[PDB]
């Protein structure tokens, strides 16, 4: 339950949000990899 609440807190914390029209390719990879892992924490959290 702690990992679920931390995941929701970080994602909604990113929904303020910083708005670039353009980013670097490795920055974009860091983004999709990043909040993709937050989906992995949340969807892994619900059934547990």
């Amino acid at each position: 339950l702690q990992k679920v609440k931390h995941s929701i807190d970080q994602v909604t914390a990113l929904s303020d949000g910083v708005k670039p029209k353009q980013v670097t390719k490795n920055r974009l990879k860091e983004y999709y990899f990043n909040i993709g892992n937050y989906y992995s924490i949340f969807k892994f959290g619900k059934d547990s």
């Binding site: 490795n26 860091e30 990043n34 892992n37």
Partner: protein
Amino acid sequence: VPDKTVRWCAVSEHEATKCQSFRDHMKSVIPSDGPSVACVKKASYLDCIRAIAANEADAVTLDAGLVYDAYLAPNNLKPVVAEFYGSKEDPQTFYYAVAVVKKDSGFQMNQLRGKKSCHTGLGRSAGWNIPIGLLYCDLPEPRKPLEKAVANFFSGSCAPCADGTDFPQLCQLCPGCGCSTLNQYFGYSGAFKCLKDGAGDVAFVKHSTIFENLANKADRDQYELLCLDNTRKPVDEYKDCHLAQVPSHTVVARSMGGKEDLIWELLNQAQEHFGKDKSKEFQLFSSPHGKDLLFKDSAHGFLKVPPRMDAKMYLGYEYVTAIRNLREGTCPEAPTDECKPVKWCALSHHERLKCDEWSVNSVGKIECVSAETTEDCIAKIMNGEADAMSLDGGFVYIAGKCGLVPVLAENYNKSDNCEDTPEAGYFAVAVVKKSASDLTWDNLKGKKSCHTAVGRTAGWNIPMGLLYNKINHCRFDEFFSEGCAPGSKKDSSLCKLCMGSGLNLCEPNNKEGYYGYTGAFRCLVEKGDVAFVKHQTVPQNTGGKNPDPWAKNLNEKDYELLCLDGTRKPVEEYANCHLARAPNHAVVTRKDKEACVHKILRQQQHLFGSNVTDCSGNFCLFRSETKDLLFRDDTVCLAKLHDRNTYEKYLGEEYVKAVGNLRKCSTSSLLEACTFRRP
């Protein structure tokens, strides 16, 4: 908030590029649960030290001489990861400091006056402390402040980080002293460029600096480096023309908040993937837009600084004393006519009573400084806050590894000339009772075993070194069922058989009743099956020799000692049945106060030795209140050690081998920290 970042200090933006590349490349091969790097840009090294102190950043890399400026309060910074300089096969930790000069320039070391000099920093190890410390005492008065007299000594120079406002001669060859890579002559390569451009007559660097900046063998055949013996030698051989050896650069961190396990967790996964051509894309130890950024370009690996080792034990004692005398400005003359009073060391508030009574009954020649374990008082000798100790041979091996020497060695045999006679030693035995006749040295599985304390000769090293070759594994808490051995880990059964209450269980000192020889005999009488003591324990506690009642009631004949083959031989006949012959105890001290502790204890012996009768109502240094405190109670005289003053020579070959078969099983942290030094 990512909640697990290691902040890092960069000295310029020109290093902050390297921090950003190390951050993005180190983001990949660590998973998302692991730690990550963040970058903090501070202007100078000292502002980063204040930054880590005020909890902004967490780590930086500093030299050996700047850790001394990093642990002084209110900073309190400790080295946590040290780096290595040799090859991967034989890792070196020390490195050399040398003085490189132009060819045919016509200086030896003693004409070195008024010539423009290229330093690498103010307080860095290989560039300031060894050059100024070598040529230091030829300077005229006033020595303090050091920079005024060095500033009048060299006819202009460049030493970065020195205050150019109060001292213009230090910042003369450089335009302004800047503490970053923006100053074009900072660092090892910068001081060598201060030699190469022709403005400097001498440049003080390490040995690999001339190798790294040049790629031509003939150009290295031009430049030379000058020695201690007033000779010039070529730069290919720095083993013979080096000024001094210094410890490595370290990543400093905080002492309380840390966090050290994330620094080691980060860099340990960093040097594997990124160390030496391990990735072609990113380099940890090389950079395109500069050299020596965040690390050295001569480093090859990182090993952990042990947790016992603090700052002063990292730098050593010789180097801490040289930097401290170079700051305060003393330059001692030292002819040995009168000696200072010896600061003795004593543990745990009974030895403070007997020590202080001895401090008053002397003239004033023996003082007392306390400790709570013996392992801590050995470190307190190594720092300098105490001088002597009386240790048994197992801790004489530890303090021998750490750099102390034995001076006087306790005798036990009464004679009309015992200051001369070298005794062979005393025999270790194990003592069992007449109630149990099924016990046998071959049959020790699941029996309770009382011990003197961890690390001692007759209680731990000699018996468990013999039990180790049978049981073939390091854990002894699983072989015996229970047993009383103090000083071991609080989790073990070996801890929870002992009696010292409360919270003083397994504390290796006289807080417990069960500590010592006689306390091992107490747990043998009360709750144990076998105890490991000296051979003289049962006669000293047999038959009303102890007025304390549990030993007042006891007798000799019921307790009989056991051989190692499995038979019974009487306590009266100890020579034909013993575990091993362990050496007698010894007084240890540092190598400089050897003659003084020798002299003061020889004179101080004859007043308060065994010749003095009427002990109650007077002072008897060798007797005590049966707890065997500050000295072994059946000493006769402190024997002289001549021709044999080294732990190797004094302890003998069989005992050094007998401890060496147990050295992989040892868990004492101070031995690990002392053996960290060796490459």
